[PDB]
Structure formats: structure tokens, C-alpha cells
Design an enzyme around this catalytic site. Structure first.
Site, PDB file in Angstrom:
ATOM      1  N   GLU A 232       0.746  -1.255  -0.087  1.00  0.00           N
ATOM      2  CA  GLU A 232       0.018  -0.181  -0.003  1.00  0.00           C
ATOM      3  C   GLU A 232       0.787   1.177   0.020  1.00  0.00           C
ATOM      4  O   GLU A 232       0.640   2.205  -0.596  1.00  0.00           O
ATOM      5  CB  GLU A 232      -0.920  -0.029   1.161  1.00  0.00           C
ATOM      6  CG  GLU A 232      -2.013  -1.141   1.162  1.00  0.00           C
ATOM      7  CD  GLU A 232      -3.023  -1.299  -0.075  1.00  0.00           C
ATOM      8  OE1 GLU A 232      -3.416  -0.104  -0.828  1.00  0.00           O
ATOM      9  OE2 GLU A 232      -3.175  -2.117  -0.503  1.00  0.00           O
ATOM     10  N   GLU A 270      -1.871  -2.171 -10.123  1.00  0.00           N
ATOM     11  CA  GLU A 270      -1.807  -3.236  -9.680  1.00  0.00           C
ATOM     12  C   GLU A 270      -0.334  -3.993  -9.977  1.00  0.00           C
ATOM     13  O   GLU A 270       0.483  -4.638  -9.144  1.00  0.00           O
ATOM     14  CB  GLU A 270      -2.898  -4.065  -9.472  1.00  0.00           C
ATOM     15  CG  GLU A 270      -3.994  -3.406  -8.731  1.00  0.00           C
ATOM     16  CD  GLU A 270      -3.659  -3.115  -7.142  1.00  0.00           C
ATOM     17  OE1 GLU A 270      -4.614  -2.406  -6.515  1.00  0.00           O
ATOM     18  OE2 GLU A 270      -2.817  -3.539  -6.597  1.00  0.00           O
TER      19      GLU A 270
HETATM   20 ZN   LIG Z   1      -2.555  -2.727  -4.802  1.00  0.00          ZN
END
Ligand SMILES: [Zn+2]
Length: 433
Positions: A232, A270
Site C-alpha cells: 500500500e 496493480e
Molecule cells: Zn494494490
């Protein structure tokens, strides 16, 4: 244990207790932007530019202020609900100490030192003015802190760690928008709010064939929460430098028949953040387009700084703030004082934020077991407690030296190290297949 970097100052100078008396400086009641209209919450400044709020996040999104399973929908397979989690002082103390311990674990690696340094230096740009010659902060990049005299003062910050919303395991890095600007994608950056808990972790499977199959595995190994937080923080790094990839840009998974039969699409953001083999699914031509795009955005920032003749809403000088952003963006400066983006320097910064800071690289530094790809299926969620050193340490995580847990990632092995994990929910055999 982790690959050390030598003796160093801790990332978090104070060992905060939740019950420590407020002081209006680094232990304080605060309000978040929107603040509509919230009661102040007790918050803790663990480092320059970085705060922790040990509360469930019912504040960043007005439509997400209810911690009960969504009376609106039916529960998703990969979700977990407990409206009581993080409601007591004891839990909040443990949350604070857990998050603190994870920052120190991250900062104990050279990679984490690098990432946390980038984050602290990544001040959201002063692009708040309607007059394109005047520098002005964007106030959603601030919080309001109650001072000893009971008045509020505005404080700029880069990062807030806050408890999850209703779905406890929906960790994510989010931020306040602007009706005109895309702050996480235009080079500006914005204050990042990471929904995270150190009190739960996920199970994964050690065989790639099993981990990437939706029907198999109970989640034998536990993800080290330091990796999850780093993941994160990597997003936060992209977003603070305004180079996040629009969530709508996705890779139609065609390397996994199971994703394919569900038509699952994964964001390039991502795949970038995971790194390793995943990042290759972003094709050269598209990545090159991104880089050019962000390079242009940096140039626009340099151009704004140059035009800047005044500064508003601050005592700080026009010169001092110009230099802060010259430094954040590694700009070059003329004999005449004009700011320019240097191509070698842009490439270097962009690459550090997107290629060097990846989940896969942190795994290498922590020397833990971890999913081999983002393109896998979650197996289970466990309750954990990383606060006691007998359970988890800054240097070793779960895999404690000079115990049976030291070797073969035995500490992460939820079967061997069963006392450290309480399985709360299985996800396998919940997916749609
Ligand atoms: Zn992520």
C-alpha cells in the site's frame, strides 16, 4: 531475518500508547477534510508528514459510515465483517503498536528506507490557486489539529494510516479528489489515506498451481503484514508523485483460464506495484505512453513554478516552496532561476517509484514467503497479533531466530505456528466457477 542496512535511527521516535495524554502536537484530536461533519478523532504523528488514526474509517467516504455488513447487498466471497473490531482502547493501543512495528520492519531495509524517504519528500504540490501565478495549498492535503488552547491549526501531511471501513480486509490507498484536477495522475500528488489493519492477515498457497487456482488450497501460509503495508505504501508513493495509473486501464487476464472465464480485469497500477513477472503484462508501448504523459505533467509543474509570482495562505516564502518542489521533482535550475525537467532525472525518479519499489522486491528484502503473483486467488483470512515480541519481531517477522520457526518459513506456516493464527473465514470454494 531481513537483510539489514546497519545501525540507524528508528522511523518512529516515540513508543506511543493510545492512552498517552493529548499534547496538540504529535498526539492530538484532529479532523479530516470533508469533516462532514465528524467529531475530532485522536490521532498520532509517528513521523514527519505521517499520521496514524486508530479508528475504523467511517470518515473518508460519507457513503461508507456504517460498519454493519452492507444491508444493501449480499456479502462477497472475499470480504470479512466485524462491526466491533477496533472499537476499544485496548484494540486501538494494539493497532498503534502494530502499525508502528511494521513501519520499523520496513525502515530496517534499504528498500523501505528508500521508499519511506520518497514518501516523506513527496509533498503534494501547491496547485490550489485559481490564479495561475499564485501558489496555494490544496486544503484536502491538510488536516485540522486541535491545539492546546482548543483552536484548530491547519497542517499539511503526506500520509495517514487508518483502520478499515466495513469490509475489514479491503485494504486500500485512497485520497481526496478535486473537481478539476486528477491529483494522483497529473504529477501533483495528494495526501494518502491507507486503510490497513495489522491485526489480520491473508493465507496463500506455496504451490503456484494451487495458489492460482480458485478451487484449491486452504491458505497454509500467512502473508507477512509488513509486505501488505509496503504494497500500500508503494501505491502511496505513486499517488504522492501524481503518477498513478488510472484504475480504468486494465489488463484483460489471458494468462489464467480462471480469470478469463470470469472475465477478470486487473489494473496496470496493480501489476506495476507487484512487480516481478506481473509488470511485464503492461506492454512496452503502453508503458511508454504513460511515461511520456507523466513527463509532460512534470513539465507543466515546472512551468507553473516558473510563472509563480506570489504565494497565499502561508507565512513560508515563495522561494522556499519553489525549492521544495524543485527538490521533490528533481528539477534543474537555470542561471536565470528557471526550472526545467531533466530527462535522465525524470526517467530515474519514475523508475525508482515504479520499478524499484515493488512488492516482489520487498519480499526479497524481508526474506519471507509470499504470493508469487498478484494474479492468484485469496484463500483465507486469519486473526493475528504481531505486537508481542514472542509472536513477531521487526527483524524476523513471524520466522523467529533460534526457535523452530526460524527455518523454512515455519513462522508463516499456519499449521506449524498455529497458535499465532486464528482462521476466520475460508474463501476457497466461494468464487463463481
Ligand atoms: Zn494494490
Amino acid at each position: 531475518g531481513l537483510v539489514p542496512r546497519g545501525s540507524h535511527m528508528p522511523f518512529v521516535n516515540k513508543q506511543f500508547n493510545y492512552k498517552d495524554p493529548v499534547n496538540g502536537v504529535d498526539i492530538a484530536y484532529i479532523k479530516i477534510p470533508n469533516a462532514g461533519q465528524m467529531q475530532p478523532v485522536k490521532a498520532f504523528k509517528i513521523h514527519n508528514k505521517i499520521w496514524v488514526i486508530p479508528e475504523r474509517d467511517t470518515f473518508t467516504n460519507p457513503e461508507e459510515g456504517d460498519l454493519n455488513p452492507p444491508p444493501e447487498a449480499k456479502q462477497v466471497p472475499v470480504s470479512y465483517y466485524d462491526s466491533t473490531y477496533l472499537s476499544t482502547d485496548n484494540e486501538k493501543d494494539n493497532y498503534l503498536k502494530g502499525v508502528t512495528k511494521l513501519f520499523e520492519r520496513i525502515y530496517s531495509t534499504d528498500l523501505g528506507r528508500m521508499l519511506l524517504t520518497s514518501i516523506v519528500r513527496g509533498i503534494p504540490f501547491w496547485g490550489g490557486s485559481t490564479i495561475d501565478t499564485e501558489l496555494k495549498v490544496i486544503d484536502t492535503n491538510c488536516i485540522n489539529v486541535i491545539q492546546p488552547d482548543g483552536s484548530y491549526r491547519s497542517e499539511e501531511l503526506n500520509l495517514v494510516i487508518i483502520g478499515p471501513s466495513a469490509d475489514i480486509i479491503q485494504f486500500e490507498c485512497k485520497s481526496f479528489g478535486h473537481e478539476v484536477l486528477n491529483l494522483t495522475r497529473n504529477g501533483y500528488g495528494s495526501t494518502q489515506y491507507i486503510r490497513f489493519s495489522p491485526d489480520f492477515t491473508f493465507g496463500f498457497e506455496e504451490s503456484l498451481e494451487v495458489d492460482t487456482n480458485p478451487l484449491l488450497g486452504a491458505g497454509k501460509f500467512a502473508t507477512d503484514p509488513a509486505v501488505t503495508l509496503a504494497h500500500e505504501l508503494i501505491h502511496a508513493g505513486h499517488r504522492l508523485y501524481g503518477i498513478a495509473i488510472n484504475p480504468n486501464r486494465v489488463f484483460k487476464v489471458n494468462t489464467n483460464a480462471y480469470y478469463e472465464m470470469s472475465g477478470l480485469e486487473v489494473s496496470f497500477e496493480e501489476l506495476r506495484t507487484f512487480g516481478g513477472h506481473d509488470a511485464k503484462f503492461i506492454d512496452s508501448l503502453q508503458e511508454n505512453e504513460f511515461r511520456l504523459y507523466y513527463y509532460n505533467k512534470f513539465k507543466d509543474i515546472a512551468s507553473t513554478l516558473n510563472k509563480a509570482k506570489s504565494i497565499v495562505g502561508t507565512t513560508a516564502s515563495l522561494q522556499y516552496m519553489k525549492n521544495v518542489f524543485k527538490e521533490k521533482y528533481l528539477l534543474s535550475e537555470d542561471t536565470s532561476g528557471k526550472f526545467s525537467v531533466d530527462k535522465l532525472k525524470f526517467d530515474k525518479l519514475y523508475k525508482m517509484l515504479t520499478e524499484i519499489y515493488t512488492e516482489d522486491n520487498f519480499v526479497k528484502f524481508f526474506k519471507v514467503l509470499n504470493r508469487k503473483t498478484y494474479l492468484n486467488f485469496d484463500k483465507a483470512v486469519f486473526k493475528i497479533n504481531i505486537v508481542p515480541k514472542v509472536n513477531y519481531t521487526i527483524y524476523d517477522g513471524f520466522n523467529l531466530r533460534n526457535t523452530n520457526l526460524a527455518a523454512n518459513f515455519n513462522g508463516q506456516n499456519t499449521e506449524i505456528n498455529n497458535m499465532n493464527f486464528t482462521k476466520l473465514k475460508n474463501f476457497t470454494g466461494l468464487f463463481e466457477f
